[PDB]
Amino acid sequence: FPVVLVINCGSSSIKFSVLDVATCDVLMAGIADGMNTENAFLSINGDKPINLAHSNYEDALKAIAFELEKRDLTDSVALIGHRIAHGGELFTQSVIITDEIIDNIRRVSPLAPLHNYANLSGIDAARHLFPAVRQVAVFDTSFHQTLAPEAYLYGLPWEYFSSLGVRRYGFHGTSHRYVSRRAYELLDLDEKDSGLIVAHLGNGASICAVRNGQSVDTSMGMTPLEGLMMGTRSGDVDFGAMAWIAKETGQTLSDLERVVNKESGLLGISGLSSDLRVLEKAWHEGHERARLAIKTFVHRIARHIAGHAASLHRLDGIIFTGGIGENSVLIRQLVIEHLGVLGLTLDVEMNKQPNSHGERIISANPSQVICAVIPTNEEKMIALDAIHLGNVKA
Amino acid sequence: FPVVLVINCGSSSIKFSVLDVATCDVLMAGIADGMNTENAFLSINGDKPINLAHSNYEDALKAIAFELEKRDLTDSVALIGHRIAHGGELFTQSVIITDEIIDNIRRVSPLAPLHNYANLSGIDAARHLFPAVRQVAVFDTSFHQTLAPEAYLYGLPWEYFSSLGVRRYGFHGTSHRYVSRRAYELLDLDEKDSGLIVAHLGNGASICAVRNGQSVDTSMGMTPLEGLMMGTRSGDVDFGAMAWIAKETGQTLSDLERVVNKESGLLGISGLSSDLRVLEKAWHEGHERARLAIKTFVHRIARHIAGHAASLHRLDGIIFTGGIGENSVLIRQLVIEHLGVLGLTLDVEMNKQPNSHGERIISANPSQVICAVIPTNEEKMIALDAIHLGNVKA
Numbered sequence A, B: 001f002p003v004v005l006v007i008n009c010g011s012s013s014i015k016f017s018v019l020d021v022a023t024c025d026v027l028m029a030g031i032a033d034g035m036n037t038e039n040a041f042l043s044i045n046g047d048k049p050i051n052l053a054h055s056n057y058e059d060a061l062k063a064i065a066f067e068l069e070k071r072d073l074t075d076s077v078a079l080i081g082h083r084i085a086h087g088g089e090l091f092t093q094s095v096i097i098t099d100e101i102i103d104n105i106r107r108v109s110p111l112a113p114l115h116n117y118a119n120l121s122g123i124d125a126a127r128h129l130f131p132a133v134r135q136v137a138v139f140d141t142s143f144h145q146t147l148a149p150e151a152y153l154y155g156l157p158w159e160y161f162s163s164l165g166v167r168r169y170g171f172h173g174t175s176h177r178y179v180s181r182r183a184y185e186l187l188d189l190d191e192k193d194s195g196l197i198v199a200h201l202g203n204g205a206s207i208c209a210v211r212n213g214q215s216v217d218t219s220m221g222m223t224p225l226e227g228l229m230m231g232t233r234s235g236d237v238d239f240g241a242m243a244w245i246a247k248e249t250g251q252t253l254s255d256l257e258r259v260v261n262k263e264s265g266l267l268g269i270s271g272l273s274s275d276l277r278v279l280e281k282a283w284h285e286g287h288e289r290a291r292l293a294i295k296t297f298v299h300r301i302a303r304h305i306a307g308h309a310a311s312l313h314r315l316d317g318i319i320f321t322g323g324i325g326e327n328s329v330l331i332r333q334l335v336i337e338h339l340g341v342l343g344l345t346l347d348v349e350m351n352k353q354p355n356s357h358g359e360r361i362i363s364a365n366p367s368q369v370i371c372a373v374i375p376t377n378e379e380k381m382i383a384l385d386a387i388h389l390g391n392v393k394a
């Protein structure tokens, strides 16, 4: 029974899952947390938060590897999948990791400095601990490389694009890819003659228009700061406003970068929390700013969904996913009601069903566009890419 | 035969028109140009670019007033209309200018520092030269004051809004207002049960959703830099990209403000011109970057039109206006073809008609949404506001 080990090695953590190759079910999951800090620790299945004070990325993954061998999983690891934050223009699909791929991930790493170097740290650690195991890189940008220039260009001088690589990349590509594929089955659509909008609504949030199987528009930019308002991120913000703020308060770009990334969005408007459940309850209890944060959140989602539909010839389906898209009955309803202009009709009993009901249609039959919830599974998508690549003769 | 004198007193110029009260036709127009510079001059009807070296705003307007009295128009000036760039949250409609209005325009002027002080200079000059004449202020922001919080809030911390007044204001309000009113007549729509999108496409460009007569979404922000890509303005740009550029090139916010406002957009992508006619011809002649600039321009327009439709219950009409919207056969067609997802059908023979044909429907009958061109007339709108206010007992 071979397994796939899937790794997402971030700035401050390493999330991992072990998936059975045959069923793509999780056999083990966990997270090394507080990385590059004094108090690091490893918690598997939320079972025994074991301390690992002062540990590098290879130490953390060696710890993880130890827990795998103690459960006799080490000898069944046939593939390792690494989530990579940014593939620039060099990656359009998942690849078997070689010296070339490593060099190329390093070349594009200036586009996502923090996150990509953590991903490379994860690759170096895994290559050390599993050298007879094929390893695969899956990029959060690659699904969006089918965007046309008119959809990826900013209105900046041409030199910023051609010399510096400033353009829209988009993220959540692995989620958008997985969820769109699942939608063709759920909605009984011909992949090659289809228009979908996927709303990945999590702590990070983005929209993607998928025309005939290909990403043709997405809401995040060169960085994850563009598009939808999110848990702590502003989303779209007038650059004139930001420059005006700078002059008025004496803050720098780096100061405002932090504000916009870490103190903004649902947190910033509500003054309470980035957590939608907290804010949903706060509104229920009469909190006005919580209500304003949610309404603002919903408004910007409706606006991007409708806007992204412009890149479709025909809108067949709108698919909600992510922690909010999967679990927020209210947010899904408010968004759909904000899109009556597209002829959407909600079946509220179907919309009320909890996420235990899995892949599910939430629109009424008279709806001009099908609406559905499809739980995302990025680890499964990575594992499937790795399994296909496992057949390759390199 | 009373006339209205209409003034738009900008950073470097004073545009004026004299309109007959009875017909709202222009009797005289002109522009004092190169203001606050060594070589200033006044050109009426493009007839004799008369020099006015080293002249203040009152000198320029005194020059203009001289040309009015030489044509015996001075004694028929019954009303003066002033275009004001920014009314903040204080102005929701056009007003008779009093000491209070002046104080309030000064209060909100920090939101548009350059432009509003030029407008106030224009008011002081006109009040000096015509003290027995009622004068009226018409704000480019006021039409958009019906926007809901969810549509005007940024995802920044609440303090930026409540203490600093950071929010979406939107501009071209006088154009959007005028054109939407004209559309109810042209499209035989009930103002109170209607959904329109107006695309004001000029050197500055913005979209506005008008639901039941009221602006409910608009594409410009706190400043004119948000939304559509324009002649020299970037439009929407990832703040992460801008911060990344700052770190990479060593430029400051003020440097990037200039790039984004003056070197970006159609100019920036094409490397040729901000002028759409130049770029249309350049594309015709095989220029690839001109083609990319136009396609990008069109893509961002389609995306905002569709997105703004989300704030309507029903989309009845899409109205093109401004220098590009009125005259660009190609851009109108490409935008409409990018919106087939909304069920638009173009009547190409009607779309080919030049702007001499005035207020005109350009959609085919099977179109689910009516598309029209309605030439804007901001001076006429200002004059009409002034004429209504001329009946008031102050």
Ligand SMILES: Nc1ncnc2c1ncn2[C@@H]1O[C@H](COP(=O)(O)OP(=O)(O)OP(=O)(O)OP(=O)(O)OC[C@H]2O[C@@H](n3cnc4c(N)ncnc43)[C@H](O)[C@@H]2O)[C@@H](O)[C@H]1O
Pocket (backbone or CB within 6 Å): A008, A010, A011, A083, A085, A086, A112, A115, A140, A171, A201, A202, A203, A204, A205, A223, A224, A231, A274, A275, A276, A277, A278, A280, A322, A323, A324, A327, A328, A329
């Ligand atoms: N600058 C950068 N450049 C490049 N890459 C970068 C980057 N920054 C980060 N990245 C990378 O991008 C990747 C994705 O990051 P994120 O975008 O942050 O991840 P996510 O999809 O939001 O997943 P997460 O688990 O955080 O949220 P969830 O869907 O559970 O959703 C959580 C939400 O769901 C809500 N929720 C859960 N249950 C709910 C319920 N019953 N009702 C309502 N809401 C509910 C919760 O309240 C919460 O609000 C990462 O690999 C990261 O390293």
Ligand SMILES: Nc1ncnc2c1ncn2[C@@H]1O[C@H](COP(=O)(O)OP(=O)(O)OP(=O)(O)OP(=O)(O)OC[C@H]2O[C@@H](n3cnc4c(N)ncnc43)[C@H](O)[C@@H]2O)[C@@H](O)[C@H]1O
Pocket (backbone or CB within 6 Å): B008, B010, B011, B083, B085, B086, B112, B115, B140, B171, B201, B202, B203, B204, B205, B223, B224, B231, B274, B275, B276, B277, B278, B280, B322, B323, B324, B327, B328, B329
């Ligand atoms: N930071 C700030 N804050 C607050 N307020 C501010 C501000 N900056 C500026 N403002 C104010 O905002 C107001 C409006 O400014 P703008 O937004 O710049 O004015 P506009 O509506 O673009 O009018 P303009 O005459 O420049 O362009 P036109 O429609 O002719 O269209 C010209 C275009 O049409 C095109 N065109 C003409 N004929 C064509 C044809 N046949 N085919 C194709 N294109 C054609 C031309 O090529 C050209 O591209 C002003 O009062 C200004 O002071």
